[PDB]
Design a protein around this ligand. Structure first.
Ligand code: HG
Length: 206
């Protein structure tokens, strides 16, 4: 995971200084099911209104946050109040994740048991995973794995790299998909590894 730690260190170096206070404020509001506005950020963080505006613009350009058409902020750092294929029940509410990795790393980052429902990117079949006290409990199909791609400090998240990450019902099905998408580059990782990625997300938000 040296690569992941180094990815986040490079990203922090690139982001504006007030990025972490703003990202925390957004992220933990989304956790609580509450869409975020710039006025709420200004009032809560105490940051100058021009700096809030410019930081939010950058985070949105990088698709590290997602805004609906009316510009309210509804997702951040993989976590979403609006629907995706990856449904996560966490902290007594139904939220969503931007990709397969997010479904598990958010459990770790938010220190929360989760129930995950998703889909095999090849077969379309349902995938169910649960986590209890940091340990994988249910996993159906039992052979479920994740396809990931190299992380990129300049790549946008929600509509960029997150769209290239997938759940597969098995490695054999991942391989069928790969045969049909021969030019795409990536690798298989395990669900346990995805859980551990939340460590680095927590550090990033610290
Ligand atoms: Hg993602």
């Amino acid at each position: 995971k040296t690569e992941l730690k180094k990815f986040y260190e490079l990203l922090l170096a690139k982001l504006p200084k007030e990025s972490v206070p703003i990202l925390r404020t957004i992220f933990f509001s989304i956790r609580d099911g509450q869409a975020v506005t710039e006025s709420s950020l200004i009032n809560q963080t105490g940051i100058n209104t021009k700096t809030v505006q410019s930081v939010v613009k950058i985070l949105a350009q990088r698709q590290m946050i997602v805004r609906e058409a009316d510009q309210k902020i509804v997702g951040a750092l993989g976590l979403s109040i609006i629907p995706t294929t990856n449904q996560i029940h966490l902290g007594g509410r139904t939220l969503f994740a931007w990709c397969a990795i997010s479904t598990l790393e958010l459990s770790t980052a938010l220190v929360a048991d989760v129930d995950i429902h998703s889909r095999c990117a090849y077969t379309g079949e349902p995938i169910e995973v649960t986590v209890r006290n940091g340990k994988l409990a249910k996993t159906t199909p039992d052979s479920t794995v994740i396809w990931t791609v190299p992380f990129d400090s300049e790549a946008p998240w929600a509509g960029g790299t997150c769209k290239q990450i997938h759940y597969f019902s098995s490695v054999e099905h991942a391989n069928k998909w790969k045969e049909e998408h021969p030019k795409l580059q990536g690798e298989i990782m395990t669900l346990e590894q995805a859980l551990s990625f939340g460590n680095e997300l927590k550090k990033f938000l610290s």
